[PDB]
Amino acid sequence: MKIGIIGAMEEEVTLLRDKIENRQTISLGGCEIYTGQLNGTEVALLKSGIGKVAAALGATLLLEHCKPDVIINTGSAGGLAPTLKVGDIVVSDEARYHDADVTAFGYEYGQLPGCPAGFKADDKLIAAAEACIAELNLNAVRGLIVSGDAFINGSVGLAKIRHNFPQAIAVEMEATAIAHVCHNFNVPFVVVRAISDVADQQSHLSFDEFLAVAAKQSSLMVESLVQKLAH
Amino acid sequence: MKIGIIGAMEEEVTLLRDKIENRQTISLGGCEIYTGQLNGTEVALLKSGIGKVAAALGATLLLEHCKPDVIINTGSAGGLAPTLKVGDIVVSDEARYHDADVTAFGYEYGQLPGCPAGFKADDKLIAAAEACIAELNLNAVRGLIVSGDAFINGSVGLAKIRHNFPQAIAVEMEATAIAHVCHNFNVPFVVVRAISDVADQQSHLSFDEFLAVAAKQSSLMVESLVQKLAH
Ligand SMILES: CSC[C@@H]1CN(Cc2c[nH]c3c(N)ncnc23)C[C@H]1O
Numbered sequence: 001m002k003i004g005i006i007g008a009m010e011e012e013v014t015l016l017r018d019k020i021e022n023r024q025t026i027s028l029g030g031c032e033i034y035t036g037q038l039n040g041t042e043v044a045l046l047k048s049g050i051g052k053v054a055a056a057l058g059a060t061l062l063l064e065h066c067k068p069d070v071i072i073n074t075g076s077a078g079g080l081a082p083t084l085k086v087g088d089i090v091v092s093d094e095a096r097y098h099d100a101d102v103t104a105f106g107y108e109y110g111q112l113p114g115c116p117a118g119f120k121a122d123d124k125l126i127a128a129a130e131a132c133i134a135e136l137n138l139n140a141v142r143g144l145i146v147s148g149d150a151f152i153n154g155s156v157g158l159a160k161i162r163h164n165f166p167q168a169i170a171v172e173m174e175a176t177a178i179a180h181v182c183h184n185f186n187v188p189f190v191v192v193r194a195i196s197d198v199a200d201q202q203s204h205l206s207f208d209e210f211l212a213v214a215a216k217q218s219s220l221m222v223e224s225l226v227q228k229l230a231h
Numbered sequence: 232m233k234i235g236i237i238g239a240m241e242e243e244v245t246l247l248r249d250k251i252e253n254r255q256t257i258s259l260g261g262c263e264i265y266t267g268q269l270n271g272t273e274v275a276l277l278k279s280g281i282g283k284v285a286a287a288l289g290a291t292l293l294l295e296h297c298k299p300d301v302i303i304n305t306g307s308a309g310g311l312a313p314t315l316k317v318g319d320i321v322v323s324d325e326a327r328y329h330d331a332d333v334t335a336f337g338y339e340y341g342q343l344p345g346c347p348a349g350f351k352a353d354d355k356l357i358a359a360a361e362a363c364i365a366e367l368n369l370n371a372v373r374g375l376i377v378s379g380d381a382f383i384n385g386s387v388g389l390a391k392i393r394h395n396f397p398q399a400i401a402v403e404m405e406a407t408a409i410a411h412v413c414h415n416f417n418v419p420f421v422v423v424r425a426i427s428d429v430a431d432q433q434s435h436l437s438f439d440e441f442l443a444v445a446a447k448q449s450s451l452m453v454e455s456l457v458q459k460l461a462h
């Protein structure tokens with residue numbers, strides 16, 4: 001069993017990267033993939049860069065070159081659900097694009113032609129993540145994560161997301177791209193991220209301040225989840 | 232010399248696909264790549280599907296599996312420059328995302344972190360395209376093409392693009408993703424598309440009506456450009 005892990009930013013992958021034993025580094029297409037064992041389990045960790053296309057490029061390389069059995073997307077997110085504080089965990093049941101609009105041809109808001117309106121995360125990965133949350137006594141929410149190529153910073157950007165996706169629990173910039181690529185290769189995925197900010201007027205200040213705590217909590221979850229999956 | 236060609240929709244690749252001799256088909260990651268000779272020149276033609284992530288996935292596969300020397304992105308576009316009529320040609324000097332916004336951290340509107348604000352198309356490919364335009368006596372405009380995951384249909388969507396990118400000559404949904412992937416693999420690209428509509432209130436009706444004429448003119452240009460490049 002080989003577990004693929006994807007994060008966008010150096011801060012989001014560095015704790016996991018550090019823990020990999022017998023680490024090898026592949027540099028291809030402007031991204032880096034680190035392979036080796038994480039507490040005895042074979043992993044391939046991708047640092048993709050930021051946004052949908054960087055994520056899509058990276059995930060495609062990871063799937064082609066490493067053939068992981070499952071994909072876990074880790075990192076930070078902007079919290080939208082009202083019980084989420086900085087550091088808390090979000091688990092995708094589904095991912096949708098908040099910025100896709102082909103409604104002129106009668107597609108659902110957020111849906112691209114040839115795609116389901118939302119990409120569903122794997123039930124067994126969701127269950128395993130929730131059992132880790134329980135075992136670690138973390139506060140978490142499971143539900144819809146939305147992605148786009150924008151950093152949400154209150155004002156009209158936040159308002160549009162709340163209007164179109166009132167059920168969305170978090171927002172970020174890669175998860176749905178990863179989900180889309182996994183869907184097209186028929187590879188199971190789950191998003192397990194942690195809250196850095198609440199996507200409001202203060203989100204730019206909060207992000208800087210609390211990225212480290214978000215990277216720490218998400219990385220703790222990914223470690224626990226990898227161990228759980230290896231059994 | 233091997234020329235990579237990318238189109239999103241079946242209508243956009245079918246004329247070229249038909250012309251390929253000794254055609255082989257590769258199916259991978261939900262896309263199709265057709266290889267063989269187009270008027271004697273070795274090509275790899277990708278049908279990607281619609282939008283940024285589908286394009287990014289496809290271009291990554293194409294570059295990895297086929298290693299083309301250059302990439303030509305063909306198909307339809309919404310015309311923004313005032314002298315463009317249906318069927319006319321647009322050539323990218325540059326591609327930018329119209330829907331990317333990380334201005335909260337002081338990136339330029341449309342720029343993603345780790346990327347230039349715009350991706351420049353190859354000068355030699357631009358020159359070769361313009362010489363084909365001349366030889367075919369086509370009406371064309373060269374300049375900025377913007378991409379996003381939205382079909383532009385007048386109203387506020389069009390207004391936002393005209394406001395942020397008044398210099399943009401056309402809008403579509405894949406070109407900048409392709410440019411980004413080419414940038415990260417250091418592969419030259421050019422966008423040569425044709426106008427199907429003017430991205431206004433009528434664009435949904437016009438698109439259906441004139442997709443065929445746009446696919447015909449862009450395909451004629453890609454053929455002429457491939458021949459020109461092979462010399
Ligand atoms: C320079 S931004 C890179 C993104 C930041 N991280 C996600 C995220 C946290 N808060 C967010 C918010 N308010 N809006 C959008 N995205 C996020 C990781 C990467 O997706």
Ligand SMILES: CSC[C@@H]1CN(Cc2c[nH]c3c(N)ncnc23)C[C@H]1O
Pocket residue numbers: 102105113239240281282306307308309310381382383384402403404405427428429430431434438
């Ligand atoms: C179901 S849409 C698939 C897109 C349509 N084609 C580009 C295009 C033409 N007119 C356009 C317009 N007004 N807004 C955005 N895109 C375009 C090809 C693909 O990108």
